[PDB]
């Protein structure tokens, strides 16, 4: 290679290299003052300003400091405002700026930087793809889709754009349309296409259309390190946790929680029925495109380990009971929620996002016939007043073909083998 030095910077190359050596050697403190001296002496030098930014970037890593990183993000931008900045250096500095903005969660700011990069380099296809990721990270699938359509209209064989276009189409329930994009994009082997998310959704799209080749892709994703197994396809995993589709209460160790749910099941049921009868708007239709057909709604009391205060006004006794069990109320990778499913409902085979939780189902109103849940190769039924426990990171599937409603209570717990340290530190899901 990259050309980083403009005309003036070539004349001070010895000073610039000496400062950069201190950074590469890890003498970060001395390197900062070395580049500060160069910025003071040569205030228009783009290489000196980039050195200052990289030193701040390294210092933020060393200190684990968000504030120091914000300084680096400003300096990376300063580089771009300087006169006569070489194209290679301008791209490097703004790319790192956007990457570090994304790291801090400044998704809107990152998007602005990505847009500047595309405007500055209109022929760099990779920068457009990065802009599409920015939109995907902020939840703007409409603009993300437009970006990848723009990429594919110029470079139709770009595998990165293909998998991300296919991902968007699958997210929009354009299942049949998404399959060739996900498949050809993965087959391209282009950088960024070897990703568990695309194996996940290609196999699931195929499953939904009855393409029996789905599990060939699950096997390849497993062989390439993306899935713990062809059955357990969660993507946010702590490696090594005991992997089992169905669990007994005793195997989980949460026997006190299970006893409470089963001893007190009727008060949980009764508050659920009261909400169905008097506040049924608190039940929200399932919104992750997991239904083939039918009606499925959930009334959530806890999510990401946070109590929903208004929701608990609707089931105050149940919330009081559950407050005694931090293994579920503090499970920041699970929920506590009522789940109602009506006849004519089929939930597609799917997997949850993480292997870090186990899922308890407490039966509340279970019709005598018509309702069942498969996890992996084993199908079971609910019973009123009784807890079932399964690892929903394994593929599971639900049918409701009864003649009245089926109400259950879902209680997620931390996987029992996670230490207290892991339970405090894992990002919420």
């Amino acid at each position: 290679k990259p050309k980083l030095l403009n005309k003036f910077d070539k004349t001070i190359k010895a000073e610039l290299d000496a400062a950069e050596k201190l950074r590469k050697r890890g003498k970060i403190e001395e390197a900062v003052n070395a580049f500060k001296e160069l910025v003071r002496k040569y205030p228009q030098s783009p290489r000196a300003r980039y050195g200052k930014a990289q030193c701040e970037d390294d210092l933020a890593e060393k200190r684990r400091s968000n504030e120091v990183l914000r300084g680096a993000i400003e300096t990376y931008q300063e580089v771009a405002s300087l006169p006569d900045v070489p194209a290679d250096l301008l791209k490097l500095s703004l790319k790192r700026r956007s990457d570090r903005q994304q790291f801090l969660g400044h998704m809107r700011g990152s998007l602005l930087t990505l847009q500047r990069l595309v405007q500055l380099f209109p022929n760099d296809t990779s920068l457009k793809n990065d802009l599409g990721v920015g939109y995907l990270l902020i939840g703007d699938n409409d603009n993300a889709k437009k970006v990848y359509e723009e990429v594919l209209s110029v470079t139709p064989n770009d595998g990165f754009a293909k998998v991300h276009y296919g991902f968007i189409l699958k997210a929009q329930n354009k299942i049949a349309e998404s399959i060739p994009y996900l498949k050809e994009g993965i087959e391209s082997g282009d950088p960024g296409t070897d990703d568990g998310r695309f194996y996940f959704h290609l196999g699931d799209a195929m499953q939904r259309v009855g393409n029996k080749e789905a599990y060939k892709w699950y096997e390849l994703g497993h062989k390439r390190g993306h899935f713990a197994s062809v059955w357990q396809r969660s993507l946010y995993n702590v490696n090594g946790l005991k992997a089992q589709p169905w669990w007994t209460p005793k195997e989980t160790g949460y026997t006190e929680l299970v006893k409470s749910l089963e001893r007190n099941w009727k008060l949980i049921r009764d508050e659920g029925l009261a909400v169905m009868d008097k506040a049924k708007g608190l039940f929200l239709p399932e919104d992750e495109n997991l239904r083939e057909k039918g009606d499925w709604s959930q009334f959530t009391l806890w999510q990401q380990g946070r109590r929903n205060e208004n929701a608990c006004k609707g089931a105050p006794k149940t919330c009081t009971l559950l407050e005694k069990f931090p293994e579920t109320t503090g499970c920041r990778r699970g929920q506590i929620k009522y789940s109602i499913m009506h006849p004519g409902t089929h939930v597609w085979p799917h997997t949850g996002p993480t292997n870090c939780r186990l899922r308890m189902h407490l039966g509340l109103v279970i019709p005598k016939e018509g309702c069942k849940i498969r996890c992996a190769n084993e199908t079971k039924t609910w019973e009123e007043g009784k807890v079932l426990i399964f690892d929903d990171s394994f593929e599971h599937e639900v049918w409701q073909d009864a003649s009245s409603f089926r109400l259950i209570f879902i209680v997620d717990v931390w996987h029992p083998e996670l230490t207290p340290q892991q339970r405090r530190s894992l990002p919420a899901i």
């Binding site: 933020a60 684990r64 400091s65 968000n66 990183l69 994304q102 790291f103 801090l104 969660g105 998704m107 995907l136 990270l137 939840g139 991902f167 997210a171 998310r197 996940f200 969660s234 993507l235 946010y236 399932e286 992750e288 495109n289 997991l290 999510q303 990401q304 929920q335 799917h350 997997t351 949850g352 996002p353 993480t354 929903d392 990002p427 919420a428 899901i429």
Partner: peptide, 18 residues
């Protein structure tokens, strides 16, 4: 959008820095 029962979002965690 959050990944509750499924894995339908591009990312399921929020970026909060260090």
């Amino acid at each position: 959008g959050k990944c509750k029962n499924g894995l339908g979002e591009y990312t399921c965690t929020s970026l909060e820095g260090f």
